[model samples]
Target: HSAYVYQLKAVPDIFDEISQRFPDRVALIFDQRKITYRELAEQCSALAAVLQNNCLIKGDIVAIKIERSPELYIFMLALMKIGAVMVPVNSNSPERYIGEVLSAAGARYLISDDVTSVPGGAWHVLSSRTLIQNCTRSGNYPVLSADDPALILMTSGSTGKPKSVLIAHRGIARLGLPVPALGNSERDCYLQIADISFAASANEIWMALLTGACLTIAPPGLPDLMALARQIESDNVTMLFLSGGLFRLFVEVSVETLHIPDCVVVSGDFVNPRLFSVAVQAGKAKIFNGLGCTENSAISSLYHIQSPVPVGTPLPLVEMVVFNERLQPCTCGEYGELFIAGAGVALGYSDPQLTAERFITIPYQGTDMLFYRTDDRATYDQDRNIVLV
Candidate 1:
């Protein structure tokens, strides 16, 4: 505890600690190849050290464009350790879009599995072989504060131009609060299906890393459901956060004893109430459907449909405030915009005015609390359950 500081304290930044505990356990699996937690964490330490000792300064930005794999994990944690913002790009995105994103985010360095087709400029894109070869030994990373922006994820904008969202260490740390109930532990393993660029992917992987759970990545272009099931069995994936349509597809076509140990559905696009019922009745799997926008982090409200998602049961440490057209709290059975007030809400986007507009102060629990005006329509049932109308 000689170097501990309070202000910047966030999540354990303890990637190293967990690696020490479960050194040889599988940290990531992809294309039948696996990297242990120790291997992954040490790689992060090496990369972070390289970043800090070389190109990155306290506030410098390093953009990462790589496939979803153990390398992505190493790149991100390395950036966090050195206090450089990690800008993740989808491997499938056009190089032009990728270049524009990096430029817009003010990033000067680029890291990739390949460097041949990068858009423009004499960027310092480090290939997988080069990055691994240069950093022979893991060195100490600078002590970073929790409030510092550790990661920058770009959002899917309407104009086909992505907007970067800066997430502080605190935002990632707060993820620990809702993790246990969602199913995570050292006993479990994780398999990645989505690109590292996705918000959900970020949350899922971070959860696994912090919890000492093993992580595995699926190969690109593989149809998700079947590949995911295979990864689950081969890699022992105990928990998954599947998007809306993926979950339904799995349940409809899958056989019994599928590879998934448990599942949480976040992208609220297509949910079959009957599927929810099946999860509850059969106990074959547990499925949670919920709503949360990127500005609000990964999850704001979770409907544990396994227990019959009541109309309005708010999550712990989070309050759901239903407001009418007049901006006042809606009475039970009345429809209105569902506003979210909780620790889970982001500090707001990079723009203060836009942040202030969406994230505002509202009276809650006898004091003014930061809240977001979620425009989704919903109402409260008799049991205080949120029934999304």
Candidate 2:
């Protein structure tokens, strides 16, 4: 191949490769605590052994409700290292909703530092703080393949009950690819402001680690726009990904104060022209609007925030097309449902019927490929940029 080809590996293998390439480089920063790639790798290995010793077998779906801390990623990496699937439950989730998500995932192992109640009686709960302290075993763990399930992320349940989407190791491997739209590089420092429970956090977690960039954690709790602005200036953060509301808040704050990151990408909703204008005038930050679902992972399509608000293009390895009700590809300027397909797509939802109906195999370029039906109406402009109808 003329261009670089990223070999799909298990999540643990990808982490190992990055650590070896930059052992001394800073991997994670939380307040005064800093962890290097070598140290993070070692801690993950040690915790993996502890988890395995505690009867956590490969393929086990473990639910985590741990608060935001250095230990959160440590445990997450540890779970993947052990070939166990991670099911991160939102700590802020309603008690009933949390129970529902846990029940739906069939997760028997629940690890949390502050959570006192086990929603389900069958769960074997463990203290997150205690496990890391006693975990002394390091080096050598069970091997995993790209096909294995690495994560199970639950939907926000705004429409109905939360659905758990099973994400394979291969899906996560695809997310590690460098995104040129964000000017992603090994030298950049990315700010991790997204909650761990959402798919947005995956970009911050994987993008930085995969490229040997610094991952700085934002202080936990309700985010204050002014506080984040101060962090951007003090930490020298180069890249950031925010939800639609936060993105708007930052843009508004930028008009009054002068703090800007190199790249700012927003999701959860479309970006309005006003928001885009403020971001452009604020500083040198390149703005982007992302469209994706939990079933598809971090990002499927990116909008480069030009005039008229066109959804820009697909990231590397991602394919998108608009299809009419007849399931035929729609021509330019015709509104139709959007479909996404690529390595980043999740394996399926927990429910087989729902999974089969949404994720369908279609013939493309002389081969059959699986694509997720977005159920969103969109059309391409004269420039072939996607515009939501």
RMSD of each: 3.7, 2.1
**Over the stretch 35-142, how does candidate 1's per-residue lDDT look in tens digits?**
888778777877767766675766677788876766767777777777787777778888888887787777778888878867776456667557756786445556
The most accurate candidate by lDDT is: 2
Per-residue lDDT of model 2, residues 1-389, tens digit only: 11354467788888898899889999998886899999998898889888988888888889998877889899999999888889887776776777777788888889987757546556678899899898776545777887789888887443676578998887767766777787787788888888877888887888888778989888877786777777777777888877888877766656433335777777777667788787777666677878767877777778876544776788777888788887777888888988888877889998899899989988876668788887778888888977766
- Compared with the true structure, all predictions reach lDDT values of 0.67, 0.80
